[PDB]
Amino acid sequence: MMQFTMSGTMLRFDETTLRFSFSRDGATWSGCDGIEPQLTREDRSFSFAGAATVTHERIETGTGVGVRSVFAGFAGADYAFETYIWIERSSGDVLCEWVPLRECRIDRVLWPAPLSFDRADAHDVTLITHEQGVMIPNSWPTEVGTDAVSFGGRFETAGGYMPWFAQLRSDGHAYIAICETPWNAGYDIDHPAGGPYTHVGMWFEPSLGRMDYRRVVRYRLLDHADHTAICKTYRAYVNERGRLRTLAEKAARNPSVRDLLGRSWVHVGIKTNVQPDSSFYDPAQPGKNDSLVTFAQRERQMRTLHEMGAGRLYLHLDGWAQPGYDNGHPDYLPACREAGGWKGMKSLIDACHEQGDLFGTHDQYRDYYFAARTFDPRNAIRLADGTMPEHAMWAGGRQTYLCAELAPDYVRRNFSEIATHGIVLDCAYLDVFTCNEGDECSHPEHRMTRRECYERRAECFEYLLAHGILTSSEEVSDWAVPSLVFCHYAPYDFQMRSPDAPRHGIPVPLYNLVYHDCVIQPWMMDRVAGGDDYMLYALLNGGAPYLIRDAAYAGMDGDMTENDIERCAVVAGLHRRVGMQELVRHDLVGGDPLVQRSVFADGTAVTCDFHAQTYEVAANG
Ligand SMILES: CC(=O)N[C@@H]1[C@@H](O)[C@@H](O)[C@@H](CO)O[C@@H]1O
Ligand SMILES: [Ca+2]
Ligand SMILES: [Zn+2]
Residue 481 lies in a domain: yes
Those residues whose C-beta lies under 8 Å from the C-beta of residue 413, and which sit 6 or more positions away, are none
The reply to whether 225 and 255 lie within a common domain is: no
Strands (DSSP E) found in 474-577: 486-487, 506-507, 522-523, 544-549
Residue 191 lies in a domain: yes
| Farthest CA pair distance, the chain | 77
- Of 240, 256, 272, the position where a domain reaches its end is 240
Closest residue by CA, ligand 1 atom 4: 557
DSSP 227-295: HHHHHHHHHHHHHHTT----HHHHHTT-GGGGGGTTPEEEEEESEEE--TTSTT--TT-HHHHEEE--H
Total number of domains in the chain: 2
The reply to whether 102 and 251 lie within a common domain is: no
- Of 240, 262, 287, the position where a domain reaches its end is 240
Q: Of 150, 317, 326, 496, which is best to mutate to test ligand 1, by the most ligand atoms within 8 angstroms of its C-beta?
A: 326
Q: Pick left, alpha or beta for residue 248 (phi over 0 → left; psi -120 to 50 → alpha; otherwise beta).
A: alpha
The reply to whether 174 and 84 lie within a common domain is: yes
CA atoms within 13 A on the CB side of 6: 23
Residue 596 lies in a domain: no
The reply to whether 230 and 306 lie within a common domain is: no
CA distance 158 to 74: 35
The reply to whether 255 and 225 lie within a common domain is: no
Our measurement of the distance from residue 452's CA atom to the centroid of its chain's CA atoms, rounded to an integer in Å, reads 17
| Segments forming the whole domain that contains residue 456 | 247-363+403-579
The reply to whether 259 and 224 lie within a common domain is: no
Strand, coil or helix: what is 94? strand
* Residue 617: strand pairing partners: 606
CA distance 175 to 158: 23
Over its C-alpha atoms, the chain yields an Rg (Å, rounded) of 25
Cis peptide before 334 (omega within 30 of 0): yes
Residue 557 in marked binding region = yes
Q: How far is CA 164 from CA 175, 216, 433, 514, 530, in A?
A: 10, 12, 20, 12, 34
Q: Is the Cβ–Cβ distance between 134 and 517 less than 8 Å?
A: no
Ligand 1 pocket member 556 (CB < 6 A): yes
The reply to whether 503 and 564 lie within a common domain is: yes
DSSP 561-618: ---HHHHHHHHHHHHHHHTTS-EEEEEEGGG-TTEEEEEETTS-EEEEETTTTEEEEE
DSSP 336-376: -GGGTHHHHHHHHHHHHHHTT-EEEEEE-SSEEETTSTT--
Amino acid in position 127: L
How many residues does the structure list for the chain?
621
Which of 393, 412, 414, 390 is closest to 401 using CA atoms?
Answer: 390
- Of 240, 260, 286, the position where a domain reaches its end is 240
For the domain that residue 226 is a member of, what is the CATH number?
2.70.98.10
Residue 519 lies in a domain: yes
Q: How far is CA 605 from CA 174, 259, 367, 578, 620, in A?
A: 26, 23, 42, 10, 7
Which of 500, 469, 499 is closest to 485 using CA atoms?
Answer: 469
Ligand 1 pocket member 518 (CB < 6 A): no
Which of 83, 80, 113, 111 is closest to 98 using CA atoms?
Answer: 83
Which of 12, 26, 43 is closest to 108 using CA atoms?
Answer: 43
The reply to whether 304 and 426 lie within a common domain is: yes
Which of 212, 209, 205 is closest to 102 using CA atoms?
Answer: 212
CA distance 98 to 111: 8
In the reported structure, the alpha carbon of residue 454 is separated from the centroid of ligand 3 by a whole-number distance in angstroms of 13
For the domain that residue 461 is a member of, what is the CATH number?
3.20.20.80
In the reported structure, the alpha carbon of residue 473 is separated from the centroid of ligand 1 by a whole-number distance in angstroms of 10
The reply to whether 179 and 299 lie within a common domain is: no
The reply to whether 155 and 32 lie within a common domain is: yes
Ligand 1 pocket member 365 (CB < 6 A): no
Q: Is the Cβ–Cβ distance between 211 and 109 less than 8 Å?
A: yes
CA distance 119 to 538: 33
The reply to whether 203 and 258 lie within a common domain is: no
Ligand 1 pocket member 432 (CB < 6 A): yes
- 469 φ/ψ angles, rounded to the nearest 5 degrees: -105, 115
Ligand 1 pocket member 558 (CB < 6 A): no
Residue 516 lies in a domain: yes
The reply to whether 73 and 204 lie within a common domain is: yes
In the reported structure, the alpha carbon of residue 403 is separated from the centroid of ligand 3 by a whole-number distance in angstroms of 4
In the reported structure, the alpha carbon of residue 268 is separated from the centroid of ligand 2 by a whole-number distance in angstroms of 7
Residue 592 lies in a domain: no
Q: How far is CA 432 from CA 37, 40, 158, 364, 476, in A?
A: 33, 29, 10, 8, 10
Those residues whose C-beta lies under 8 Å from the C-beta of residue 196, and which sit 6 or more positions away, are 118, 119, 120, 138, 139
Residue 190 in marked binding region = no
Residue 452 lies in a domain: yes
Those residues whose C-beta lies under 8 Å from the C-beta of residue 328, and which sit 6 or more positions away, are 321, 322, 369, 371, 372, 373, 396
